[PDB]
Design a protein around this ligand. Structure first.
Ligand SMILES: O=S(=O)(O)OC[C@H]1O[C@@](COS(=O)(=O)O)(O[C@H]2O[C@H](COS(=O)(=O)O)[C@@H](OS(=O)(=O)O)[C@H](OS(=O)(=O)O)[C@H]2OS(=O)(=O)O)[C@@H](OS(=O)(=O)O)[C@@H]1OS(=O)(=O)O
Ligand SMILES: CCCCCCCCOCCOCCOCCOCCO
Length: 153
């Protein structure tokens, strides 16, 4: 009820699109969420997420794409089993390139990130968390799904 924290860790996967094309394969990573309930009805929740996809060519070129976000928002409990939340924060996207010819360069952008999710408590001490997040970084669109689990105490 009042003063309950929930901590969860989860898998995260992004679909990254620009101008009708999708980056292959999808960046993947993790999501950590921390929630604190002020009372039986309202609380706050914070989220960090990161997904990555690396690429290499050998016999030599390499690059990687990384997205991470920090978001937060109110979380409302419906009953003992289910709570819903919305999130707002910042997303940062980065594409980094390097070769044996000397090139080492990146492109990056920070913009708003928007999210929404829910937490399910099959028992009062457990959490299953699922959320979606979206960020537009210039003309690159990053949509991220997250599915996690953890504990409530
Ligand atoms: O270039 S440095 O000698 O300052 O060392 C910085 C290392 O962090 C990286 C990580 O990026 S990654 O390889 O893509 O994972 O860059 C990150 O940190 C820098 C430095 O910022 S700081 O607060 O002065 O230290 C940011 O660069 S800048 O904004 O200062 O110009 C980066 O921001 S940006 O993405 O280029 O917009 C930041 O990247 S990120 O936000 O973590 O994605 C690497 O620096 S980098 O290759 O120049 O980007 C360094 O890590 S590494 O494993 O040595 O490559
Ligand atoms: C894992 C997310 C990678 C997001 C990189 C975004 C870079 C921010 O702005 C760059 C805009 O132009 C750079 C083009 O880089 C291509 C990245 O998108 C690939 C989708 O096909």
């Amino acid at each position: 009820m009042e003063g309950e924290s929930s901590i969860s860790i989860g898998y995260a996967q992004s679909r990254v699109k620009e101008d009708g094309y999708k980056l292959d394969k999808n960046p993947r990573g993790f999501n950590l969420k921390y929630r604190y309930e002020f009372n039986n009805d309202w609380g706050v929740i914070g989220s960090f997420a990161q997904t990555r996809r690396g690429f290499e060519e050998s016999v030599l070129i390499d690059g990687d794409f990384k997205y991470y976000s920090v978001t937060a928002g109110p979380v409302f409990r419906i009953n003992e089993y289910v709570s819903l939340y919305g999130l707002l924060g910042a997303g940062h996207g980065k594409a980094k390139f390097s070769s044996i010819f000397g090139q080492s360069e990146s492109r990056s952008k920070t913009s708003l990130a928007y999210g929404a999710g829910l937490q399910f408590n099959p028992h009062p001490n457990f959490v299953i968390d699922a959320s979606y997040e979206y960020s537009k970084l210039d003309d690159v669109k990053v949509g991220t799904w997250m599915l996690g689990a953890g504990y409530r105490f």
